[PDB]
């Protein structure tokens, strides 16, 4: 399983890479815009913040397939092994086919439906990113979409993986993991919630208090 | 998975072959009739419109097994590697057996029931095409028929594949894919719906607006 | 159960009112636009085409709540007992509340989610119209949305009914009916498919042939 | 069904009361603290922002049952018919029993488990508020807890209602509604998401474009 | 729903009756033996510890039906309205029939199977007490037994109620409540766990901290 | 619920009538034959052994409807209010109709299928007796047959009851009770197993030992 | 999968062997009796009617194991590779074991229960034939029996196959195929129904009418 | 699958070994006691009655682990390759471990719970024998216990097999087989029921009558 | 499957290692504190009590990752091959990553949620220990958490095993085993309950009584 953070916050990535078993960092245009640093600045900084080991993802902006390929080349000049995110639209699918022919790995993003996601994998995408919370917020079922998508990839495009994205609560992430998703990307707030629990803190405090009671200290 | 378009519209096939990851094009007598061009004109055009890479399918018209075999030979003289569609009737099954003996690949079409479909595969058909929407429109369950048929082929005639056909909505196609169908053929309207979504367009617009807000342009 | 036709085709309404047990006719802005006749011409014609017995529905066009209320008054001046369709948007909900206070019956339309639909009923709508095929075509589950919506109304706003709408195949309509929808509106092609079956025609022909064989005629 | 907003934002309540069919407003200590206005200021402002029709809820702060009863009296002196929220702790349960004897309506809050919630209803609470997202975020299932709690109330304390609370996504609210909850309280962001959908906006725009095409305007 | 404590600890009952919404107290021979006080001392103390409002249950010791009836009379001379617990054995069933004829309310106890429990209700018992944890500890399913028993009573002896007993964890009690049991009796440790949660304490502390931050105190 | 014993053992009936809440005794030709006493001897003895209050059932032996009616009269001359068991065969159904016209209550016996059983109830039988273990032993599912039969009676012949019969293990009886059967008849061995359990005996012994430990006696 | 016809109608077999993909023909004593030709006449005629390529099955008549073995030798002298059908009775099982030792392939027939069928496979039968319709007609579930039998063979005697038999409707055959049966034998009427459908004929007629409309003929 | 008879009846074993495909014979202390012959007489007779090919099982009587090991050695001196049955108690588990170290194969018997059974396999037992009917008779579910036990062995101790035992009806044996049990032992009455069916006899009789009708005899 | 005891009771471990098939012993800070012996005394004693064959586990006490690594080194200096338990907190995850790099095997403990548990396995833990009863006691579902966690490990971190812990009743342990947990640790009371059953003792007593009846002794 590959676990990513969905962020352009370099300081946070450096701090959290020590804690989480990260495969890398994913970005998108809104995340990059929120951080205010251009791609040629922030991508290398994110790469460094993971000690040069993590995989990076970043998204094209052009609206024609040819423009998207040119964007991909720009991204790859910044980070040689970056995975290029392409929105799964008509022109995006055309771009994914072209990038497959060029040997540049892609992720099919802005996926709101399972068939849409599958098309991107059939076209060559290595990863497919459904926007779980967007589907949930807009009256659908993000989890059903993810469940369906994973099944479709495993039956029909088995080289491709779901990279589940767009989360407001740990439960959504848990449900994607239970559906079999082979990768996931978490925003910082959800990631931090997933490792901090009042019940866990209470269990550890009880261990400390019992140890103190018997041995007069809380250290080993 | 093999994805086909169900059409005789040469201009559309050329345009869509750039977008979709197509395995080829399927035709039937109504589709050919609607396009108004004879088989010896349209089939070579369709073959060219896919850059010579796609598989083609076309259907016999005769009502006796012997006549269907003669139709198959005519079709194969137009396109050497064409897959011949035979309606799964008593004479059709007899024809499928004869074509198997001749080494000509066949598809069993006009399938309205799972056992009917299985018989065509046991007789030698490489593909079996249930008419999903026809079953749905006539008070049955196209999806249950497809689900059943796919299970029957995988248990009892595992060399054969379901090629699901006859669709009025993307949901029918999705449900066939979730049932495991190893091939599918889409009419142009359903195919175009499967890659165009208001929610996806809105996600892409939001990315563009956020990028504009931060960087003063919408390009990378 | 209330069965409606979703059309502005006066000739077809006449012909089908004799066959179907219709409660009335629903229109929307696309349906009215397609027919090319203004509301003050077509609505009285549709009312006549059902022999003055059917209920009519038509939709507001304004984008502010106050404008929608004014549109409702215009519609009611054309057909005194017409049910006014209001899209379930923020201003639409505000309009539904105002129309409830005025005693004008409403339908909440353009429903793509169950919670959205429920809000329109809580605001006062007597009917809620999910767009089943639109949800299906855009990667969701129209049938799950209808199932959920009907359950929500029956638990939380039991005076309101689902009026299921937007269909490409009889199976969608059947599934809405099996989910419990107390009303439905069919486009003409789907309505005609629901009463014409090759197997039924074959059963009737067999009855006629057997009768002929025994009695020398096909009449009673 | 009773629909509440979970907020102390008086301007927003006034604006949203025109759109949503609100039963009232719920507050808690964090919400009140975030708004920075004391109870004796903000509660009367909220009451007015709903035109004097909505029900209000506010929470005690004391940690002994006797202190909580005194807090309840203070709250009722600000808003005569306010429902008093009491955290479901040992002293909270004792307070709920005392308030039942005094005839002051209560809500059992900070519910993280179904049995805990049931105990508050058996003690006399009219409403029980599970913290759905808190349970979800801390590795449980908020929806299973709500489902279980509602069943427990309907079997064992049928005068009491679930008032589902603590939401980060509309899907959580939908699932609570489907589980049968007779009341719910939404934060502003989730409430606004529940009434704004790209697919709905696109449907309305298509209606406008079709109308414009036929009639040369977008008004009725 | 009737909630009981399964104890002979008078001091604890007095303390917990202020917190829990108790219907009364159940005792059995082991519970009485553990407390070391005879029945004619402890039963009146328990009755007072609940302020004279709670129902009491206590168990016969004799092994013949006639002896059990005599024990019932002794118990009723200590507490006039006490419910008499009879083990569901052959002689116990005979005793339950006799006590029904005498108008003395009974509970069928030491139930390890659903049919056994039903027989006690058919014989006249008002309550039937499966030993949930005993069934669980001995390789069965206490919850399945309770689920089955409650269904049997509601179908076949609807005047009788399950009084679920014998618990080591709150989850067992929750599952009995979800199965529909109309009464339950909790040992003190499980009852205390059901009202004390680290996550709830943390929620209350966060409320206090937020209030402090804004207003400079933790009181209302 | 009506509980019967399936026996001709008069001594056992008398002993068990004190323990079980019996509605009566059922006999059949094999049971009567096994006991070796003629009907005119054993039926009165069984009636007395229940203190003149139990319902009795006995079976006809004739193979024609007319003969079965005559047998019914012979049975009624021995026990005036006896319920007459008739095997559900073609002649048996004819007899059941005749007996309905005469006002003599009947039970449809030797039922091996649900539809067969339903026919007997539609003909007038007050009770229908599937042979559960016979169906089980002969490769069917006695429990499915009972489940189906009970549903059929409640939907289609609601005045009739299932009287489940033919048991080798308590589990079969439990499963019939859980399926909703309103009456049941148990052979003596199964009945005795249903009230004697090693685990229950161990619970009672533990209560006695704990009481002895604390109070120096095992009596109350 | 192996598909058989269940018939002694030599003319029909010859005609149908051209249409169906047949593995052979099964006979039984009633089928042979109905055809009125002795085994030494009809078996060679059936073998010829399939062009010498189909497998044959025929049934022993003796009631002792030794007699059944002698019958098997007689059958094998008529058709050297015939599969010998043995009814699964006590003596039949003994015969199956003896025939296994002799290397003569057997089928266990007249199977009305799954355990009975499994015993025949454990004894050495290569095929097991449940009588589906007989089980259905006699108040059981033929499909459950087949489903269970197939599972038992695949777990416990995996060299053996279910040869499902005894059908009145195509739906029974479909359900056996869906249960996984690796062979089936169809009576002629059911086989003919499985390849003849009014809806399929209507689809083919529509293709012809559309082709005629466009090209002025119905031939290719 | 290994099929055993649960008996000490030497004459019956000889007769049935010709009919059933037996793997051997199991005995227990009650079975041996019922036959009245000592182990050193009956075990060699049973071994002979199966022609020297069947596996035998017999049970230790000692209550300490050391005594059980001595009993195992005595049993193995009578039948060199006998499988030794050890009750799964604390001392039994200790004995199973010792016998594993000595290389003497064991069966863990008197299993009334799945975890208990699993422990015996983890300790070294090759077979684990749940007492299905005992669990059923005592208010549990023998089939759930067997289902659970088989799952536990296959996951956690895959070298061990369930040997299901203790049966009063063929249905119990069928359900154990459907649960996957790799071995089973049947008492003689259940075994005989499993091969004798009135419906099967009637099928064979009909075949005979039809053959007679056509050919004037009932032989081949 | 690996079975552990959760204890620091050296005498009990020695006694139980003769009965149970133990893989080793787990300790935690409360267990060690309860035993009152320091780690450098008790761990070698536990190791000896299992004859030097069992695996041991013990827990770090430090709150920073660097401190936890130092604690791990101290533990490994006491017992060279000990598995080091680390609480799954932010610093614990950081420690698990460091220990993975150092090649020191770890267990992720104090797990109250499935995602939390998975993170510890992704970070390098060989075992993950959910606190089953703690989750149950605090209003969750310990069994659902274990079920989910095991599925997550098998899909996403297949080198890791669930070591289920924290039990009050054998049923909890059974349900963990049925969920697939590859290891488990039992407190002494639960372990002892799992091998002691009144029904089993009664079965063994019946065997002894039958043997006595036939042979005049209870020994072999
Ligand atoms: Cl994936
Ligand atoms: Cl397929
Ligand atoms: Cl409705
Ligand atoms: Cl509620
Ligand atoms: Cl109850
Ligand atoms: Cl009934
Ligand atoms: Cl098979
Ligand atoms: Cl097994
Ligand atoms: Cl595991």
Residue of I36, I85, I161, I206 marked catalytic? I85
Per the document, the length of chain G is 220
Structural element, H or E, at residue H204: helix H198-215
CA distance A159 to chain C (A): 23
- The verdict on a CB contact (< 8 Å) between D214 and C94 is no
Distance from CA of F106 to the nearest CA of I (A): 42
The secondary element (H helix, E strand) that includes residue D90 is: helix D90-102
Name which of I173, I177, I204 is nearest H89 (Cβ-Cβ): I204
Q: Give dist(CA H43, CA H25) in Å, integer.
A: 10
Q: Closest Cα partner for H3 from H140, H127, H186?
A: H186
Count: domains in chain C = 1
**F9 phi and psi angles, rounded to 5 deg:** -90, 100
**For residue F49, how many other CB atoms are within 10 A of its CB?**
22
Q: Which residue of A has its CA nearest to C111?
A: A139
| Rounded-to-integer distance, Cα C175 and Cα I28, Å | 56
- Rounded to the nearest whole angstrom, what is the distance from the C-alpha of residue E89 to the centroid of ligand 7? 50
Contacting residues of A for B213, CB less than 8 Å apart: 33
Query: Measured between alpha carbons, how far is A120 from B134 in angstroms, rounded to an integer?
Result: 29
CA atoms of F20 and F22, how far apart (whole Å): 6
C-alpha span between B32 and B9 (Å, rounded): 9
Q: Please tell me the distance from the alpha carbon of residue B208 to that of residue A30, in angstroms, as a whole number.
A: 8
The span from the CA of A149 to the CA of A166, in Å, is 15
> Which segments of chain E are extended strands (E)?
2-6, 24-26, 55-59, 83-87, 106-111, 127-130, 161-164, 183-186
What is the Å distance from ligand 9's center to I70 Cα? 28
Ramachandran sector of residue I103 (left: φ over 0; alpha: ψ -120 to 50; beta: rest): left
Suggest the residue from H203, H209, H216, H217 to mutate for an interface test with chain G (most G CBs closer than 10 A). H203
Is the CB of E158 inside 8 Å of chain A's CB atoms?
no
The DSSP H or E segment spanning I123 is: helix I114-123
Burial of A159 (0-12, 13-18, 19+ CB in 10 A): exposed
- Report how far residue F36's alpha carbon sits from residue F34's, in angstroms, rounded to the nearest whole number: 5
Residues near H179 by Cβ (< 8 Å), separated by ≥ 6?
H143, H146, H147, H150
Q: What string of DSSP letters covers chain A?
A: -EEEEE---HHHHHHHHTTS---EEE--HHHHHHH---HHHHHHHHHHHTTT-SEEEEE---SSHHHHHHHHHHHHHHSTTPEEEEE-SHHHHHHHHHHHHHT--EEEEEE-SHHHHHHHHHHT-SEEEEBHHHHHHTTS-HHHHHHHHHHHHHHH-TT-EEEEB--SSHHHHHHHHHTT-SEEEE-HHHHHHTT--HHHHHHHHHHHHHHHHHHSSS--
Q: Which chains touch C (3 or more CB pairs under 8 A)?
A: A, B, D, G
Rounded CA separation I71/I60 (Å): 5
Q: How far is residue A168 CA from its own chain's centroid? A: 14
Q: Is G8 exposed, middle or buried (0-12, 13-18, 19+ CB in 10 A)?
A: buried
Phi, psi of C54 (to 5 degrees): -85, 150
Q: Which helix (H) or strand (E) holds D129?
A: strand D127-130
Closest residue by Cα to residue F8 from F183, F207, F188, F201: F188
Q: What is the DSSP string of C128-172?
A: EEEBHHHHHHTTS-HHHHHHHHHHHHHHH-TT-EEEEB--SSHHH
Q: Are the C-beta atoms of I91 and I65 separated by less than 8 Å? A: yes
**Helix pair angle (F39-49, F10-17), 10° resolution:** 10
Question: How far is Cα A58 from Cα A28, in angstroms, rounded to an integer?
Answer: 6
CA-to-CA separations, C99 to C73, C96, C123, D14, E51, in angstroms, rounded: 10, 5, 9, 20, 57
Q: Do chains A and C touch (3 or more CB pairs under 8 A)?
A: yes
Under a CB-based contact definition with an 8 Å cutoff, are residues C126 and C83 in contact? Answer: yes
B and D: number of Cβ contacts within 8 A: 12
Q: What DSSP letter does each residue of I163-175 carry, written as one string? A: EEB--SSHHHHHH
Integer-rounded Cα radius of gyration of chain C: 20
Q: Is the dihedral of CA I172, I173, I178, I183 positive or negative?
A: positive
Q: Where are the alpha helices (DSSP H) in F52-187?
A: 65-78, 90-102, 114-123, 132-137, 142-156, 170-178
Q: Ligand 5 centre from E113 Cα, in Å?
A: 15
E147 touches chain H (CB under 8 A): no
Return the closest-CA partner of residue F215 out of E79, E46, E84, E35.
E35
State chain I's maximal CA–CA distance in angstroms.
71
Residue of B nearest to D197 (CA): B199
| DSSP annotation string for B26-88 | E--HHHHHHH---HHHHHHHHHHHTTT-SEEEEE---SSHHHHHHHHHHHHHHSTTPEEEEE-
Give the Cα separation of H50 and H12 in Å (integer): 10
Indicate the resolution in Å.
Answer: 1.8
Nearest CA among F171, E114, I202 for reference residue H136: F171
Q: How big is the F-G interface in CB pairs under 8 Å?
A: 26
Round to whole Å and give the CA distance between I119 and I108. Answer: 9
Please report how many Cα atoms fall inside a 13 Å half-sphere around the Cα of residue I109, on the Cβ side.
23
Structure tokens at B84: 């011949």
Q: Which residues does chain H have within 8 Å of residue G74's beta carbon, measured at their own beta carbons?
A: 220
Q: What are phi and psi of B190, to 5 degrees?
A: -65, -45
The pairing of strands B2-6 and B183-186 is parallel
**Residue E144 burial (CB count, 10 A):** 17
F27 in Cβ contact with F59 (< 8 Å): yes
Residue D165 CA to residue D185 CA, distance in Å, equals 5
Would you state the torsion angle of the CA atoms of residues B11, B12, B13, B16, taken in this order, to the nearest 10 degrees?
130
The answer to whether H45 and H10 are in contact (CB under 8 A) is yes
Say whether F101 sits in a helix, a strand or coil.
Answer: helix
Q: Is F85 a catalytic residue?
A: yes
The bridge status of strand A24-26 relative to strand A2-6 is parallel
Residues of C in contact with G197 (CB under 8 A): 199
Handedness of CA H78, H82, H86, H91 (dihedral sign): positive
Burial of A51 (0-12, 13-18, 19+ CB in 10 A): exposed
Contacts of F181 (CB under 8 A, 6+ apart): F146, F150, F161, F162, F163, F164
- Residues A134, A168: contact at Cβ < 8 Å? no
Residues 6+ apart with CB under 8 A from A35: A8, A9, A42
Read out DSSP for D188-212? HHHHHHTT--HHHHHHHHHHHHHHH
In the structure encoding, which two tokens stand for residue F127, read together? 């009770």
d(CA G175, CA G144): 10
**Is D124 touching E (CB cutoff 8 A)?**
yes
Closest-CA distance, H89 to chain G, in angstroms, reads 31
Q: Are I116 and A200 a contacting pair, CB within 8 Å?
A: yes
Q: Residue D155: what are its φ and ψ, rounded to 5°?
A: -80, -45
Residue F189, C-beta contacts closer than 8 angstroms, at least 6 positions apart? none
* Distance between CA atoms of residues D21 and D194, nearest Å: 13
Asked if A122 reaches chain B (Cβ–Cβ under 8 Å), the answer is yes
Contacts of A192 (CB under 8 A, 6+ apart): none
Element of type H or E holding D149: helix D142-156
Chain H residues touching residue E116 (CB < 8 angstroms): 139
Residue G70: CB atoms within 10 Å: 16
Q: How far apart are the two ends of chain F, measured CA to CA in Å? A: 34
**In angstroms, what separates the C-alpha of G140 from chain F's closest C-alpha?**
6
Cα-based distances in Å from E155 to E143, F114, G16? 18, 21, 57
DSSP state of E80: T
Radius of gyration of chain D (CA): 20
Nearest bound ligand to CA D126? 4
Asked whether the beta carbons of residue I171 and residue E199 sit closer than 8 angstroms, the reply is no
Supply the Cα-derived Rg of chain F in whole angstroms. 20
Query: G41 alpha carbon to ligand 9 midpoint, in Å?
Result: 65
Strand, coil or helix: C57: strand
Q: Does C206 touch chain G (CB under 8 A)?
A: no
Q: How far apart are CA H70 and CA B2, in angstroms?
A: 69
Annotated catalytic residue, options F85, F97, F161, F206: F85
E100: three-class secondary structure by DSSP:
helix
Phi, psi of H133 (to 5 degrees): -70, -30
Q: Is H133 on the interface with I (CB under 8 A)?
A: no
Q: How far apart are CA H20 and CA H6, in angstroms?
A: 13
Distance D191 CA to ligand 4 centre (A): 20
Catalytic residues of D: 85
Residue C17: which residues within 8 A CB-CB, separation 6 or more? Answer: C49, C50, C51, C54
* G-contacting chains (≥3 CB pairs under 8 Å): B, C, F, H
DSSP letter string, G89-156:
SHHHHHHHHHHHHHT--EEEEEE-SHHHHHHHHHHT-SEEEEBHHHHHHTTS-HHHHHHHHHHHHHHH
C-alpha–C-alpha distance, residues F147 and F176, integer Å: 7
CA–CA separation, F75 and F61 (whole Å): 11
State residue G59 phi and psi, 5-degree precision.
-110, 140
Among H14, H57, H50, residue whose Cα is nearest residue H183: H57
Assign residue I147 the CATH number of its domain: 3.20.20.70
Task: Evaluate whether I154 touches I180 at the Cβ level (below 8 Å).
Answer: yes
CA dist H208 and G87 (Å) reads 12
- How many angstroms separate the Cα of A212 from the Cα of each of A207, A216, H18, I33, I131? 9, 5, 74, 8, 22
- Spatial neighbors of A174 by CB under 8 A, at least 6 apart, are D139, I113, I114, I115, I148
Dist. CA G27–CA C151, nearest whole Å: 55
Asked if residue E26 lies in contact with residue E165, where contact means CB atoms within 8 angstroms, the answer is yes
Which residues span the domain enclosing D106? 1-220
CB I162 within 8 A of CB I130: yes
Do B199 and D201 make contact, defined as CB atoms within 8 angstroms? Answer: no
**Matching residue, tokens 């008779």:** H137
């Amino acid at each position: 399983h590959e676990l990513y953070l969905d962020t352009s916050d370099v300081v946070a990535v450096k701090a959290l890479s020590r804690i989480f078993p990260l495969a890398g960092v994913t970005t998108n245009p809104s995340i990059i815009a929120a951080g205010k640093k251009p791609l040629d600045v922030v991508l290398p900084q994110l790469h460094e913040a993971m000690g040069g080991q993590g995989r990076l993802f970043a998204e094209v902006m052009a609206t024609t397939a040819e423009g998207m390929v040119n964007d991909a080349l720009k991204l790859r000049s910044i980070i040689a092994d970056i995975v290029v995110k392409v929105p799964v639209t008509a022109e995006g699918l055309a771009a994914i086919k072209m990038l497959k022919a060029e040997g540049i790995p892609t992720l099919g993003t802005a996926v709101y439906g399972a068939a849409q996601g599958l098309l991107s994998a059939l076209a060559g995408a290595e990863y497919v990113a459904p926007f779980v919370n967007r589907i949930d917020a807009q009256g659908g079922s993000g989890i059903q979409t993810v469940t369906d998508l994973h099944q479709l990839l495993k039956m029909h495009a088995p080289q491709a993986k779901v990279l589940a994205a767009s989360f407001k609560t740990p439960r959504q992430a848990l449900d994607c993991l239970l559906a079999g998703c082979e990768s996931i990307t978490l925003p910082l707030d959800v990631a931090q919630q997933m490792i901090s629990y009042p019940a866990v803190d209470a269990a550890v405090a009880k261990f400390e208090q019992d140890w103190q009671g018997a041995f007069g200290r809380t250290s080993i």
